[PDB]
Amino acid sequence: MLKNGKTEDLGCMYKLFSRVPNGLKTMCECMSSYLREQGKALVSEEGEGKNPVDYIQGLLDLKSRFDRFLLESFNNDRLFKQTIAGDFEYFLNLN
């Protein structure tokens, strides 16, 4: 449901795993890995050429989806936000 966008499941999972530190750390690792994988898939080559719908603003589409994940389920945790901001700054330069 990080790919299906079912935010209620993400919210319940975060409610479970915020109870113990280093449980949200694995959440950060998985979230940032998924973000980096998808972002480097889009901002880089997509076979032959690039699609501006999913390259110039598709980056923003995914970034908006992931802020929706951060808001509706993660409640804007500082560490998640810092990792995603780092990911954005890193694969924004690989246009």
UniProtKB/Swiss-Prot annotation:
Source organism superkingdom: Eukaryota
Expression by tissue: Brain, spermatozoa, and testis (at protein level). Widely expressed.
PTM info: Neddylated. Attachment of NEDD8 is required for the E3 ubiquitin-protein ligase activity of the BCR complex. Deneddylated via its interaction with the COP9 signalosome (CSN) complex.
Subcellular location: Nucleus; Golgi apparatus; Cell projection, Cilium, Flagellum; Cytoplasm, Cytoskeleton, Spindle
Role: Core component of multiple cullin-RING-based BCR (BTB-CUL3-RBX1) E3 ubiquitin-protein ligase complexes which mediate the ubiquitination and subsequent proteasomal degradation of target proteins. BCR complexes and ARIH1 collaborate in tandem to mediate ubiquitination of target proteins. As a scaffold protein may contribute to catalysis through positioning of the substrate and the ubiquitin-conjugating enzyme.
Assembly, per entry: Forms neddylation-dependent homodimers. Component of multiple BCR (BTB-CUL3-RBX1) E3 ubiquitin-protein ligase complexes formed of CUL3, RBX1 and a variable BTB domain-containing protein acting as both, adapter to cullin and substrate recognition subunit. The BCR complex may be active as a heterodimeric complex, in which NEDD8, covalently attached to one CUL3 molecule, binds to the C-terminus of a second CUL3 molecule. Interacts with RBX1, RNF7, CYCE and TIP120A/CAND1. Part of the BCR(SPOP) containing SPOP, and of BCR containing homodimeric SPOPL or the heterodimer formed by SPOP and SPOPL.
Extra remark: High-glucose conditions in renal tubular epithelial cells lead to up-regulation of CUL3 expression, significant increase in CUL3-mediated ubiquitination of MRPL12 and dysregulation of mitochondrial biosynthesis.
The family this protein is said to belong to: Belongs to the cullin family.
Pathological association: Pseudohypoaldosteronism 2E: An autosomal dominant disorder characterized by severe hypertension, hyperkalemia, hyperchloremia, hyperchloremic metabolic acidosis, and correction of physiologic abnormalities by thiazide diuretics.
Name by which UniProt lists this protein: Cullin-3
